[PDB]
Amino acid sequence: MNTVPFTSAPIEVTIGIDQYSFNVKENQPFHGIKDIPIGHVHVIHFQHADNSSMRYGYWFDCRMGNFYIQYDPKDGLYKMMEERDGAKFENIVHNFKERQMMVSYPKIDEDDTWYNLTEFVQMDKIRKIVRKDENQFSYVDSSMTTVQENELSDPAHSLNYTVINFKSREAIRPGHEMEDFLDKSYYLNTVMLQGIFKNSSNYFGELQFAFLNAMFFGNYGSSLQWHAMIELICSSATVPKHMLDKLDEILYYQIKTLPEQYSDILLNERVWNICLYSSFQKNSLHNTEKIMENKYPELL
Amino acid sequence: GAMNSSNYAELFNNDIKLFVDDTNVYRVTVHKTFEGNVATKAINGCIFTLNPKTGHLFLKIIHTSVWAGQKRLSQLAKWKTAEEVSALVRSLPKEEQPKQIIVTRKAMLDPLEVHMLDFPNIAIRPTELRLPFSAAMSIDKLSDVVMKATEPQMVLFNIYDDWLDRISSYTAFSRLTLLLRALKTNEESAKMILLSDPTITIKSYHLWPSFTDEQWITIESQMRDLILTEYGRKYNV
Numbered sequence: 001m002n003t004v005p006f007t008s009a010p011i012e013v014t015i016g017i018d019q020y021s022f023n024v025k026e027n028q029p030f031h032g033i034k035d036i037p038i039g040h041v042h043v044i045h046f047q048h049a050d051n052s053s054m055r056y057g058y059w060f061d062c063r064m065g066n067f068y069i070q071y072d073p074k075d076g077l078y079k080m081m082e083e084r085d086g087a088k089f090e091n092i093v094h095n096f097k098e099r100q101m102m103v104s105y106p107k108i109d110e111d112d113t114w115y116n117l118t119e120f121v122q123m124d125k126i127r128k129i130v131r132k133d134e135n136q137f138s139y140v141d142s143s144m145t146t147v148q149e150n151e152l153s154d155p156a157h158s159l160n161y162t163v164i165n166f167k168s169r170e171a172i173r174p175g176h177e178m179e180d181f182l183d184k185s186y187y188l189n190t191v192m193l194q195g196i197f198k199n200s201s202n203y204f205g206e207l208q209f210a211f212l213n214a215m216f217f218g219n220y221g222s223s224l225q226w227h228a229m230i231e232l233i234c235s236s237a238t239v240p241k242h243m244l245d246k247l248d249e250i251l252y253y254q255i256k257t258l259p260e261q262y263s264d265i266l267l268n269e270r271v272w273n274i275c276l277y278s279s280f281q282k283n284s285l286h287n288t289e290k291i292m293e294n295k296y297p298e299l300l
Numbered sequence: 301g302a303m304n305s306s307n308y309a310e311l312f313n314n315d316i317k318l319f320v321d322d323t324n325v326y327r328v329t330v331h332k333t334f335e336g337n338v339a340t341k342a343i344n345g346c347i348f349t350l351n352p353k354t355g356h357l358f359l360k361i362i363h364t365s366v367w368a369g370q371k372r373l374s375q376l377a378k379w380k381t382a383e384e385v386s387a388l389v390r391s392l393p394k395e396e397q398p399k400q401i402i403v404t405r406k407a408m409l410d411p412l413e414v415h416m417l418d419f420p421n422i423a424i425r426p427t428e429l430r431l432p433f434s435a436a437m438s439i440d441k442l443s444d445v446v447m448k449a450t451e452p453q454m455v456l457f458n459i460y461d462d463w464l465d466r467i468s469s470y471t472a473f474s475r476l477t478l479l480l481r482a483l484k485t486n487e488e489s490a491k492m493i494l495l496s497d498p499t500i501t502i503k504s505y506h507l508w509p510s511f512t513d514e515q516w517i518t519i520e521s522q523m524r525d526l527i528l529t530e531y532g533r534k535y536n537v
């Protein structure tokens with residue numbers, strides 16, 4: 001079990017760690033988060049009490065180094081940093097734990113939610129989507145735009161998701177125009193899975209990261225990316241059985257977790273109604289369809 | 301964007317454009333079978349692709365053999381239209397390729413856009429106009445060449461005959477759309493109007509009769525009357 005200490009909490013802020021969050025008051029004696037499960041990626045994330053716009057945060061994997069948060073009063077945000085002096089870090093953490101100024105990552109033993117939401121997400125792939133190679137952790141916020149969004153403006157601060165575009169030459173083989181546009185199997189299996197992603201696990205990993213960015217930061221390009229990757233599978237007639245079954249599980253836990261009042265900006269009516277009721281895979285998402293109909297029948 | 305009453309003179313500027321209409325691509329007669337079930341028999345069709353400025357019509361004849369062994373024919377008709385329009389553009393010299401293609405039904409937008417991915421600088425547009433191009437098969441010479449075809453065939457026409465020698469394109473297209481609106485609302489009356497006088501003939505190289513300017517005014521009035529009329533007969537006014 002690992003620890004992310006905080007130097008201090010100078011400004012009132014709502015702090016999130018994965019799907020948990022808690023309020024810290026201006027200059028409250030708060031020195032971080034303990035008992036963080038090893039073996040998963042995580043996202044620490046922030047919503048200033050003053051300015052609820054620009055929620056931001058950091059994706060990290062405690063196996064990759066000792067990380068801490070420190071408020072920066074010049075740039076005015078909580079910044080993640082790496083401590084390279086391992087002895088200095090253990091000492092700092094132990095002192096803060098002894099003084100019990102740390103909240104405990106509050107995982108219920110039965111609860112596989114985070115694992116299910118991050119099963120295929122790997123830090124090494126996150127770092128290729130979020131390019132900042134001098135750090136082992138990755139910053140995302142509400143306003144960062146995607147590579148595809150910038151094609152339709154600062155490249156260093158972008159989300160480099162795999163571009164998917166159903167009306168593109170990459171997606172449509174010459175002479176298979178109708179066939180490839182109505183049955184995206186080619187684009188899914190040859191172009192994307194075999195060509196770009198290499199395997200379905202990298203595909204699912206980007207898909208899950210897109211959703212999490214979409215839910216945690218209301219990042220709009222991420223939501224677009226999540227729906228696109230769903231729609232590409234649902235619109236393919238030929239999808240390995242194992243991918244369909246895993247997709248059903250993936251989506252199920254995203255829908256289960258997606259807070260109810262954020263659904264109308266994070267759920268695309270057209271894509272879901274198509275995927276669940278019109279598409280080739282309309283019969284292959286039993287769990288996702290059942291939770292969607294019981295929890296969001298309005299959208300459908 | 302979409303083409304409507306407000307940006308109507310754009311049709312007659314000097315940017316090459318084509319209207320494409322797919323209404324008459326997939327045509328069927330419905331009949332009863334010996335067993336008392338219903339079945340369709342396809343008849344030849346046509347893509348109506350028209351340069352509104354010049355009057356040049358690229359009438360691609362769709363022979364019923366296209367449909368043999370195919371499923372979901374109405375959806376395939378849209379893709380077949382798109383494939384044939386895109387082959388037409390590719391056949392044309394660069395300086396003759398359109399800069400816009402306006403489709404008369406929005407269902408053609410995705411089919412055409414996918415087939416034209418190779419022409420990113422050709423704008424594919426819908427329209428809000430209720431253009432009467434479906435009535436093209438009420439023009440006897442067009443109907444005749446479609447029904448006689450025994451194979452796929454492109455036939456080239458000028459749908460304005462020689463009118464542009466005397467009137468502008470704007471007036472030419474307004475006349476055409478009035479004739480076709482009339483033919484669509486009451487084909488018999490419309491054709492009666494056009495041929496009543498046996499002394500006005502259709503040149504062999506023309507589609508419509510050789511009316512004088514004065515005679516076209518009378519004809520145009522008669523077609524307007526028809527169109528208002530049938531509108532009453534239909535709504536009782």
Ligand SMILES: CC[C@@H](C#N)NC(=O)c1ccccc1
Pocket residue numbers: 016019021055142214215216217218219259262265266
């Ligand atoms: C679309 C709403 C979105 C944004 N921005 N999400 C949150 O605020 C939020 C905060 C904490 C945990 C889960 C969700």
